[PDB]
């Protein structure tokens, strides 16, 4: 029943099958890391991650004179077993958290069919996979195997704070935005969590608030996740798509702007700012896309590799883009099917739905000002659990987010930088 079905341990022994040493196709060299695969098509890697860009290696903090206004740095963060064990520990809980609201186990549910499609190959007639799109794991006998994944949660670079899901491009293809998907690494930490103002007025002003409540992290790592449903199927809106913030004075003298891709994701009164005609285009747009991979399917004759049959293949993205088949056995996109997991990805799996479901309380726009980073720990159960996150039932913590509210429950929460002001 539960969305991992082992409780791994950092020191368990490697066994080359799901806790094993492991290379990235970041396009360069790397020593092997220690990973761990969760559950069908998930990997977790306790590291921090300065692999997927070779550019941020350096985990060290510029001179304070260089850093920016909401950021944190701590290069000693995720060094130790220690704590490579309690992230791996809080990293499976929150997954256990989200799979077991319906919202969860449906996104989880999308994210472990959403297989990155098979357009590697030259020749239309053949389906090749995208080794981008594999993690290349060591044997028991020392060699390695390529392995497709899904997804792959890390810890975060050099800035700890900037959470984000990424995943290696293609010399020609748009994998994200093209209907095919690619693997998604997503940076994240159960670590530490961002503190945000009750009151709507004082959330989204730059100047007031310290930051009284604590943002569950459970929210966090499922808007990592939406992100990853929509880069899976390959649907994510283009982040020069933007929109100038004019609902917020302090955004606006600052010539703000927030993509639509965190508008979307985001959700609720946010996703309106999408306007109904720029929302066809991009649907339409989609569409288009999914028209192609059918096409590309039904042109399909050979298959590389011998892990799979052509028509094992052809059915398991005919399973993922939920296509129909006509007598003749082609492909083709129906409207109704198309809009309605377009819409299963865009509009229900969303930031503010997710909150519904996890019965906490949360930013009400994404369009707010930060206010301050604390460190947690949610692994013990007398701090955080699966049913309830921090508002643990039959305790003070119960009621009215007492749970996430930093002053009651301040013994779960210890800041370490206030970011009001300094914007
Ligand atoms: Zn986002």
Request: net charge neutral.
């Amino acid at each position: 029943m539960p969305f991992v079905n082992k409780q791994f341990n950092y020191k368990d022994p490697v066994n080359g099958v799901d806790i094993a040493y492991i290379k990235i196709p970041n396009a360069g060299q790397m020593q092997p890391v220690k990973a761990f695969k969760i559950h069908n098509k998930i990997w977790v890697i306790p590291e921090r991650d300065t692999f997927t860009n070779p550019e941020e290696g350096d985990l060290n903090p510029p001179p304070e004179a260089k850093q920016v206004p909401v950021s944190y740095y701590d290069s000693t963060y995720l060094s130790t077993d220690n704590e490579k064990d309690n992230y791996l520990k809080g990293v499976t809980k929150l997954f256990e958290r989200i799979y077991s609201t319906d919202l969860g186990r449906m996104l989880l549910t999308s994210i472990v069919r959403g297989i990155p499609f098979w357009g590697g190959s030259t020749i239309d007639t053949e389906l090749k996979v995208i080794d981008t799109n594999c993690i290349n794991v060591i044997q028991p006998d020392g060699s390695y195997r390529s392995e497709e994944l899904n997804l792959v949660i890390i810890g975060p670079s050099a800035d700890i704070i900037q959470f984000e899901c990424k995943s290696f491009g293609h010399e020609v293809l748009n994998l994200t935005r093209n209907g095919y998907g690619s693997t998604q690494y997503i940076r994240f930490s159960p670590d530490f969590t961002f503190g945000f103002e009750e009151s709507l007025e004082v959330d989204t002003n730059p100047l007031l608030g310290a930051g009284k409540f604590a943002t569950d992290p459970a929210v966090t790592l499922a808007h990592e996740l939406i992100h990853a449903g929509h880069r899976l199927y390959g649907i994510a809106i283009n982040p020069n798509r933007v929109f100038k913030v004019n609902t917020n004075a302090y955004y606006e003298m600052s010539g703000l702007e927030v993509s639509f891709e965190e508008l979307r994701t985001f959700g609720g009164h946010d996703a309106k700012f999408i306007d109904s005609l720029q929302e066809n285009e991009f649907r339409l747009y989609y569409y288009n896309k999914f028209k192609d991979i059918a096409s590309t399917l039904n042109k399909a004759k050979s298959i590389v590799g011998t892990t799979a049959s052509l028509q094992y293949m052809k059915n398991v993205f005919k399973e993922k883009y939920l296509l129909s088949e006509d007598t003749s056995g082609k492909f083709s996109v129906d409207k109704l099917k198309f809009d309605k997991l377009y819409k299963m990805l865009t509009e229900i799996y969303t930031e503010d739905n997710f909150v519904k479901f996890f019965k906490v309380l949360n930013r009400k726009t994404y369009l707010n000002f930060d206010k301050a980073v604390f460190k947690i720990n949610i692994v013990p159960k007398v701090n955080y659990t699966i049913y309830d996150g921090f508002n643990l039932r039959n305790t003070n913590l119960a009621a009215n987010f007492n749970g996430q509210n930093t002053e009651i429950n301040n013994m779960n929460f210890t800041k370490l930088k206030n970011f009001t002001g300094l914007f």
